[PDB]
Amino acid sequence: NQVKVLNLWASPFGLRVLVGLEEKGVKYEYQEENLASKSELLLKMNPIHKKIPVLIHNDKPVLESLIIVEYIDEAWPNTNPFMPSSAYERARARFWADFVDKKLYDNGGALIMKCKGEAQEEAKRNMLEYLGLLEGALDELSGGIKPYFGGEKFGYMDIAFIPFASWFQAWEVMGNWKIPLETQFPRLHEWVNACMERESVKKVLPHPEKVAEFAMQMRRRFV
Amino acid sequence: ENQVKVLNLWASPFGLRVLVGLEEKGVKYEYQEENLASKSELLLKMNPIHKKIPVLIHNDKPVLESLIIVEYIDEAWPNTNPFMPSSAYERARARFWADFVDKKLYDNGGALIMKCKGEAQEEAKRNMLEYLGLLEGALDELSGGIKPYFGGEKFGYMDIAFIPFASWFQAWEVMGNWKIPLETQFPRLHEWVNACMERESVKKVLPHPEKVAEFAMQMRRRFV
Ligand SMILES: N[C@@H](CCC(=O)N[C@@H](CS)C(=O)NCC(=O)O)C(=O)O
Ligand SMILES: N[C@@H](CCC(=O)N[C@@H](CS)C(=O)NCC(=O)O)C(=O)O
Numbered sequence: 053n054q055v056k057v058l059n060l061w062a063s064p065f066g067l068r069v070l071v072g073l074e075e076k077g078v079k080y081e082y083q084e085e086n087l088a089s090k091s092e093l094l095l096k097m098n099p100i101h102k103k104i105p106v107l108i109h110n111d112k113p114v115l116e117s118l119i120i121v122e123y124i125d126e127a128w129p130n131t132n133p134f135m136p137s138s139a140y141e142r143a144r145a146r147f148w149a150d151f152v153d154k155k156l157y158d159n160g161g162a163l164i165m166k167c168k169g170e171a172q173e174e175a176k177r178n179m180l181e182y183l184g185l186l187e188g189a190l191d192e193l194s195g196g197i198k199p200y201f202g203g204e205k206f207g208y209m210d211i212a213f214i215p216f217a218s219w220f221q222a223w224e225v226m227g228n229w230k231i232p233l234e235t236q237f238p239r240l241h242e243w244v245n246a247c248m249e250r251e252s253v254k255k256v257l258p259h260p261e262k263v264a265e266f267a268m269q270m271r272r273r274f275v
Numbered sequence: 276e277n278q279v280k281v282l283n284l285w286a287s288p289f290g291l292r293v294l295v296g297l298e299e300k301g302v303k304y305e306y307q308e309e310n311l312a313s314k315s316e317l318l319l320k321m322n323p324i325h326k327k328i329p330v331l332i333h334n335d336k337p338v339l340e341s342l343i344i345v346e347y348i349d350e351a352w353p354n355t356n357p358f359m360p361s362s363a364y365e366r367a368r369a370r371f372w373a374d375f376v377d378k379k380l381y382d383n384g385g386a387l388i389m390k391c392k393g394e395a396q397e398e399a400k401r402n403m404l405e406y407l408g409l410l411e412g413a414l415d416e417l418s419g420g421i422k423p424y425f426g427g428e429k430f431g432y433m434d435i436a437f438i439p440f441a442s443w444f445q446a447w448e449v450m451g452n453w454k455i456p457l458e459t460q461f462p463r464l465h466e467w468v469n470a471c472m473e474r475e476s477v478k479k480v481l482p483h484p485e486k487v488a489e490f491a492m493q494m495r496r497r498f499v
Contacts, residue, residue: 100409109364112364114364114367115367115371116374119371119374122366122367122370123364123366123367126363126366127363127364139347139350140333140336140338142346143339143344143346143347146343146346147339147343150340150343155324
């Protein structure tokens with residue numbers, strides 16, 4: 053087949069790509085990579101970053117997950133629109149996906165993984181602040197409409213964010229705490245539960261327990 | 276009393292992107308210079324999470340993050356000067372190379388030439404040459420050999436994304452006490468810069484490299 057995906061099973065960034073592929077109804081090859089022993093294929097396709105995910109479409113590589121998502125939407129444009137119609141809402145969608153990566157993850161969950169003590173508590177403070185902002189972002193982009201970031205339509209932003217729900221338990225485990233979604237962030241809770249009813253998400257999103265084990269394994273490398 | 280307002284710092288390549296893009300589309304706009312030491316409440320109302328420039332306000336709508344702003348500008352005035360390519364893949368690659376300009380050439384190149392000393396700075400310049408090599412390649416990749424732009428004959432997203440750093444070359448040369456061998460080792464980029472500088476947009480908004488250099492040196496002294 054014309055389409056291949058190189059990924060790490062627990063990576064939210066490639067899970068974006070899989071979810072996106074399924075939503076468009078694309079059949080694809082999947083190759084699991086060991087980042088400790090990377091395929092020459094990955095190095096040939098992503099020599100600059102040497103990172104997953106990689107999407108190979110007709111042996112041409114698409115790199116960096118959000119761009120890949122936009123690529124998928126633009127490469128399979130006849131159905132299932134990820135992007136909004138208006139420019140500004142698209143700008144906001146991009147802004148918020150970017151925000152998910154740079155803040156909720158890079159300046160949140162990653163530090164929960166890597167950090168210890170007051171640093172970790174600070175990471176958790178940050179995570180709550182960001183999830184608050186994202187709870188607000190949901191009502192912003194949805195226009196109050198339920199239950200997705202695209203209201204009734206499951207879109208770019210839903211795709212960018214929902215794989216991190218597979219990481220919540222991991223974050224809870226490594227920070228030894230409880231994330232109060234149901235109470236402090238109910239829209240996101242409902243949204244996750246809603247997203248979990250879709251075929252795509254059920255097909256590709258892994259069990260949180262496994263991710264958590266995996267995350268702990270990775271935490272030991274740090275701390 | 277016009278509908279587009281830009282909040283910016285004059286020397287930032289990232290806001291210069293925005294200005295260049297607006298000039299290409301023929302959009303008339305207000306410009307507001309921000310002091311990052313005393314930020315306007317407006318900048319804070321409009322960009323409360325990052326509190327950064329540039330900010331583009333279009334009819335009370337704040338557009339944030341320079342590349343996204345560039346895309347917004349293209350998508351909001353689409354009947355005029357298309358920035359983005361026709362093919363999805365080339366758009367994917369253009370966006371990729373833009374991200375590459377920000378995260379590599381700058382964050383892991385020029386920023387470090389400003390911030391660092393010794394072996395670190397030396398390695399930053401080594402990197403800059405590597406990245407500029409890759410970008411010399413990027414131009415031919417995306418242009419299809421066609422000259423003189425990243426869009427061949429059309430002046431686009433990546434051209435806009437990259438060309439404000441040309442005002443920063445001289446500054447990097449000074450802060451690193453070296454010369455970037457554009458004319459010899461990256462001649463496409465040389466040709467491309469000179470071509471882009473023939474456009475009114477770029478001529479209109481891009482500052483003299485000398486003042487950029489002074490400014491860069493001052494802040495380097497703040498970093499020593
Ligand atoms: N910038 C990439 C980030 C991808 C990424 O770094 N994923 C992690 C998952 S933790 C990874 O495995 N990176 C490859 C590596 O370890 O070098 C994107 O937007 O998708
Ligand atoms: N939203 C901006 C972020 C770029 C950025 O970091 N700009 C710098 C100036 S070069 C800034 O605003 N710094 C604010 C500060 O240093 O406090 C973009 O378009 O990329």
